[PDB]
Structures are given as C-alpha cells and as structure tokens.
Write a protein that binds this ligand. Structure first.
Ligand code: NVD
Ligand code: MG
Length: 460
C-alpha cells in the first residue's frame, strides 16, 4: 500500500451560540451551501483528516464526538478515529482521521491560550492541535477572538498572544512560534472581524446581501483591511469569500439578519459580518490548494452559520536510507553564499544565525556576522562565505529537495531571536548558485529580510 504524496483536509468553524446542533449537520462536512462548494460527485469520498473548531459550544466532548463520528459515518460509511480533542471553556477543536492513517500520525500535541487580563480573561482564546503525518508537520488553531465592531485592535492583540504562546509542534524549534513550526498551519475560528460601515447603512447592507453583491461589503471587512495593512495574519492566505456574511442571524431561519442593538448585545449593533474564517500558511513551494470555502444554508440553531474549507495538501514519506536517520550522508551538503540579513532593529549587538531543519541531526549555529549601516538607516548583517556547510542526514534528491531550512537571527548579547524565516530546498537546479530569500518576522511582525545564494549538493 503506497504512502500518499497528497491528502485532503476538511476545516470547519462554527460558533454554535450555546445551543445544541440540529439532528442533521452533514451539509457542513459535504461543503454544501453558499460560496465555493464541493462537487456532488465527491460526496462519498472521505477527506483524510477532518478538523472541527467550535465556539460557544454547549456540548460535552463525548456528546460532540458522537455527533461528529455519526455524521461522517452516514456520509462516507467510514468510522473515523479520534486523533485529538481539546477544549478551553466553550472553545473546542476535534481532529478525526481515516483509520488507515492511524500509524501515519504521531507526535500529537494540544494546547490552549487564554487572551486578555482580568475583565477580558475568562472566555476568549484559542485551542490547537499539531501532529506529524509521515514526514509532514500539520498545525491547527481554533480561536475565538474579542467581539464587537470597535475592537479590531484587541482582536489583533489576541492574534499576537495566541501565536506567541500556543505551544505546539517540535519544542526543539525554540526560536520559532507556530507560524514557522509546520509544513501546513491552518488558523480558523470566530475571528470576530466585522464589516466596518455606518450603523445607519444596516438595511442597505442587507439589500446588498440579498442581491449576492459582496464587493462593497468585503472592501470594508476588517480582517481583509487589517491584513492588507500588515496588522495581523502576516504571510497567511485566505480563499476569496463568495458566501454571505455568516453573522448575525435570527435563529431557526437564515432569512433574517439580527443586527439592532439589544440589552443582550450590550447595546451594540451587529451589522452582518464575516466573523467565521479559515486561513492558512504553508512552507514555500509546498502544494496547498483550497478546493472549497463556504457556509451552510440549512444549519440554523445558532446566530452564526457554519463555515467549511477543504484543502489538497502535499505530504512527504518517512524517509529511511542506508545512512540517515542516525548518521550524515556525506554525498549531501547545503552551502550559503553572500548571505546578509537586513534588520529593522535600532540595537547594535552582534548577531549569529541558527539553521533548524528535520534534514539535520541537530540545529547549526553560525559565527557572528559583520554589522554595516544601510543607506536608508537599516542594520545589514553580512555573513559572506563564513556560514557553516550544512550536512543533511539523507542525500537522496527525492527527499532533500522537499525539505526546508528555518533561519533565526539571534543577538550574541541576549541569545534572543530578532527574526525567523524559512527557505525551501525545492531548487531549480543542484550544484548551482541560486538566489534565496525569506522575510524575517518576530512575534509574527516583520523585523527584516534574509537573502543570498544557496548551492545544494544531492546524490544525483
Ligand atoms: C460507495 N460508498 C462507499 C458509499 C455509498 C453510499 C454512501 C451513502 N450512504 N451510506 C452511508 N453508509 N453507508 C452508505 C456512502 C458511501
Ligand atoms: Mg455569540
């Protein structure tokens, strides 16, 4: 039975509004309703992995697991295995996989982050799951961010706390947050970003939704505008939105948006908004294709509609050679020529690099670079041809060209990372000097750039 080089992944996010679900929720897992929907001809074809995020979830883990497994068994006739389930308050993540994957999945991690302080600590935050699927690391974050049209900045702060403090994936990747630890990272939830239009325009917005004319509403969506201004979710993707706003509906129909201020809303308006979202970030030049992104029309127990997204995702096999794992493959090497970091920092410490990759036995520390002043104020850290030659565990090009090198630039004075990035080894050529580049981030904000040339030697 061959190992796969692709899988499909279902992502669901649903704020259940503290109500039990209706008896049938299969439309969610079939990617049927509004938006980019899945073809009927695929209905019996199971996804490899189903990841379900809920918010305001009133059910026990047992109760929800029984509903989810029943739903999938009815669709596919397959009894899915539970990979992980984790709940913080009423925020929950469930990961289910086809039984054939049980011995492909390992290194399962769960964690949560509580956002806010005092007043603002007690119901918002995130849960997450990570695991290895053969040679591929997968991370999944379900976040319920701060509510309210005039709290976009709080949401952005919630995002940065979650990506700093959520402890998933390989703890040896100590300079790296979740935005660099996984081949594929999916971040979804009730992100609570709103359509920023005047309250007086409520009926006009409703009119536009009835006409399926979303352009003038999406141009005011806070998540799109904050992402365009690099305030949040830097270097993440989102499929184009082609479904109606998923919030805030009257329960038991989808015919009415309930937007007017009420004591129950704290006298806040809830103009129709795309609160419920799926975003992703994959390492450079790894295959990832969104094959659906939409909302269900027939699940009406909540004031939110469920959102689905499905993905094709490239995966690699757990490679064994005669040499690695457990030694180097002298036939393989990675050289960095003429590299320099450009940093936004005002500080004047010396810097060194760390190279981390599962193609190395352990991470590699460079010598200090040479600091120069850039022409427009910047710090330029030059490494020249001083960088250590990296010795991968396996030299076979079918393995090595699918790998990635994480780079951290660290202060010699503090050993703290000033920037993290990632370089693909999916090169146009081997034994050839080729340009490389990554942006550098820290706490998920842009801090600089790393660029230079690479020369990769494989056994071919
Ligand atoms: C061809 N296969 C595998 C198939 C066919 C029909 C269905 C839908 N109805 N169902 C539920 N449980 N068994 C049948 C699911 C799978
Ligand atoms: Mg709510």
């Amino acid at each position: 039975q061959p190992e796969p080089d692709m899988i499909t992944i279902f992502i669901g996010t649903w704020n259940m509004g503290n109500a039990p679900p209706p008896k049938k929720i299969t439309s969610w897992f079939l990617s049927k309703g509004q938006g980019k929907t899945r073809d009927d001809s695929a209905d019996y074809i199971p996804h490899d992995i189903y990841v379900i995020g809920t918010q305001e979830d009133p059910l026990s883990e047992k109760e929800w697991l029984e509903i989810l497994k029943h739903s999938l068994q009815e669709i596919t006739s397959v009894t899915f295995k539970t990979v992980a389930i984790h709940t913080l308050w009423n925020i929950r993540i469930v990961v289910l996989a086809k039984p054939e994957h049980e011995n492909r999945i390992s290194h399962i991690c769960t964690d949560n982050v509580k956002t806010g302080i005092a007043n603002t600590l007690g119901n918002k935050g995130a849960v997450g799951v990570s695991f290895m699927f053969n040679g591929t690391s997968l991370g999944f974050v379900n976040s319920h961010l701060t509510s309210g049209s005039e709290k976009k900045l709080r949401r952005n702060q919630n995002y940065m706390n979650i990506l700093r403090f959520l402890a998933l994936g390989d703890k040896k990747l100590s300079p790296f947050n979740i935005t660099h630890r996984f081949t594929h990272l999916f971040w979804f939830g009730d992100l609570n970003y709103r359509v920023d239009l005047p309250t007086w325009e409520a009926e006009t917005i409703i009119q536009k939704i009835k006409q399926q004319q979303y352009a003038d509403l999406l141009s005011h969506d806070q998540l799109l505008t904050e992402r365009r201004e690099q305030k949040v979710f830097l270097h993440f993707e989102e499929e184009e939105i082609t479904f109606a706003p998923t919030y805030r509906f009257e329960r038991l129909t989808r015919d009415k948006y309930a937007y007017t201020k009420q004591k129950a809303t704290g006298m806040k308006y809830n103009l129709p908004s795309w609160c419920d979202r799926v975003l992703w970030k994959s390492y450079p030049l790894v295959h990832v294709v969104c094959q659906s992104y939409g909302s269900t029309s027939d699940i009406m127990t909540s004031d939110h509609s469920p959102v689905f997204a499905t993905f094709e995702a490239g995966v690699t096999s757990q490679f064994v050679s005669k040499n690695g794992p457990g030694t180097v493959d002298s036939q393989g090497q990675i050289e960095f020529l003429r590299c320099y970091a450009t940093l936004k920092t005002k500080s004047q410490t010396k810097f060194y690099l760390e190279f981390h990759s599962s193609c190395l036995e352990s991470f590699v520390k460079s010598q200090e670079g040479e600091n120069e002043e850039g022409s427009e104020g910047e710090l330029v850290v030059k490494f020249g041809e001083t960088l250590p030659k990296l010795k991968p565990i396996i030299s076979d090009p079918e393995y090595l060209l699918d790998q990635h090198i994480l780079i951290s630039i660290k202060s010699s004075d503090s050993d703290e990372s000033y920037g993290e990035g990632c370089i693909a080894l999916r090169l146009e050529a081997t034994e050839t000097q080729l340009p490389i580049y990554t942006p550098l981030t820290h706490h998920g904000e842009l801090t600089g750039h790393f660029q230079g040339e690479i020369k990769l030697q494989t056994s071919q």
